[PDB]
Structure formats: structure tokens, C-alpha cells
A paper describes a structure:
GH19 chitinase hydrolyzes the glycosidic bonds of chitin, namely beta-1, 4-linked N-acetyl-D-glucosamine. One of the physiological roles of chitinase is to defend plants against pathogenic fungi by degrading chitin, a major component of the cell wall of many fungi. We demonstrate that this remote loop directly accesses the fungal cell wall, and surprisingly, it needs to adopt a defined structure supported by long-range intramolecular interactions to perform its function.
To investigate the contribution to the antifungal activity of the 45 substitutions, we constructed mutants of Anc4 + Loop II with substitutions in proximity to loop II. We chose six substitutions within 4.0 Å from Loop II and introduced them accordingly to their proximity to each other’s. C The crystal structure of Anc4 + Loop II integrated with all six substitutions (p12K, n13H, s58T, n193G, y194F, and d197R) revealed the interactions of these residues with loop II. Mutations A, B, and C increased antifungal activity 4.7, 1.2, and 5.4-fold, respectively. Cell wall binding activity assay confirmed that integrating these mutations increased binding activity to the fungal cell wall. Furthermore, crystal structures of Anc4 + Loop II + A and Anc4 + Loop II + A + B + C revealed that their loop II structures are retained as in the structure of Anc5’s loop II, namely the antifungal active variant. Our mutational analysis revealed that some of substitutions are conserved in loopful-type GH19 chitinases and six substitutions are needed to perform new function.
Author numbering: 0 to 231
Amino acid sequence: MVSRSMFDQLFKHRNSFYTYDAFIAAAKSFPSFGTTGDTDVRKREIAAFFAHVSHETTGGWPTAPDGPYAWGLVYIEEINQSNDYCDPSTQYPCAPGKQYYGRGPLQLSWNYNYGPCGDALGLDLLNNPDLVAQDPVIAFKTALWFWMTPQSPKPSCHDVMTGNWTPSSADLAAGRVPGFGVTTNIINGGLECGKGNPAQAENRVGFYKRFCNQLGVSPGSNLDCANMRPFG
């Protein structure tokens, strides 16, 4: 896994809601996370997951102590909470009086994600979405659920980083070569990769390179998703 002192180095300025013990408890729901492959592969997977988490929750500024990548895990809830984030569904019905705005380390959003995430975790997140912003174990589990779950045609980010996803010829033709860049593409490639404004993807890479440096691992190849088409 990762030790308490290293978690406290990566996340030196975090919101104290996000405890190390909560992260460790959540990771036990997905025992292959960070335990797959040799030491370099494990370190890159952990750095990659934390880079995305940090991008989505960062409270940094350019002159912040320890630099602009040292302020991950500051945010819990989406700040703009007026829309319900509800698309009508017979499988995952929007609960009366509830909203599905972003919550937790990967900003889980929409009834159509809270539904299946809760089903997989054995939790009624569809009818109690506020659980994600109440309980840091649940919060971390929702982020790991996303990271560990394939959604065809997309592989899991876990499988990409650990060598368990081999691209098809169409993937390769589209520039989807395994590495950090493909994880950005999976998470939000329609807006952030290809010809999207690359500011946000570049920020994710900045966090990733910082965390790789702190963990003592090379970031590897194929970091940039501007050279890459979103999955169909």
C-alpha cells in the first residue's frame, strides 16, 4: 500500500476529513489496488490515482507552501450545488428531494453513477447520496469504485496502469497507448483530451509528476492525451 507518513507527505495540506485510516479501510474493498505488479508499477498506479483525486479536489494557489501540487484533498462537495444532476432513469430513479452533484475524491456525479456505485458497494447511495460527503470511508470507496470498474468500451484505469489492458488496433490508431494519458481520457477525455483545451489534462500531469517524484518512480510514457482521441 502506502505508509501513513508518505500519505501525509503527498497530502500535507488536505482537509482532515480525508484520514489515512479511512483511505486504508476503503482500499481493502479493492485489494488489488496498489498491490498489482512490480514496485514501479505499484508506485505509478498509486501516484496516478492520487493525481486525479488531487486535480478534482485541489485547494492550491501558485505561491502556496510546498508548491501548487501540494494542496490535494481539500474539497469534499461540489461548490455549485443548484442543479440536481438528475437524468430520468427507470433503473436508477432520482430520489425525491435529493441531488447528485459532485462528492468525494473523484467527484462522483449523477444518479446514473451513484446508482451503480452504491449497488457495487452494498450501499444505497442512490437514495442517500449525501453518504458520500458524510463518511470518508464511503468517500474513498466511491473513488476506488470508479478507478477499478470497467465500463465498456473503456477498461478500468486500474487495468491500464498495471499492464492488464492491451489496446486494440483501433485504440492504437487513435493514439490510446497505455499510460497516464489514457486514464485522463477515461476519466474526462471528451472535454480534456484530443482537441479540448489541454489546461486541465496538463494540470493532472503536473500532479502525477510531483507524486511520482515523491514516491521515487519514473512517470513512464504516454503522459499527454492531446495526441489521443476520446474513446468511442
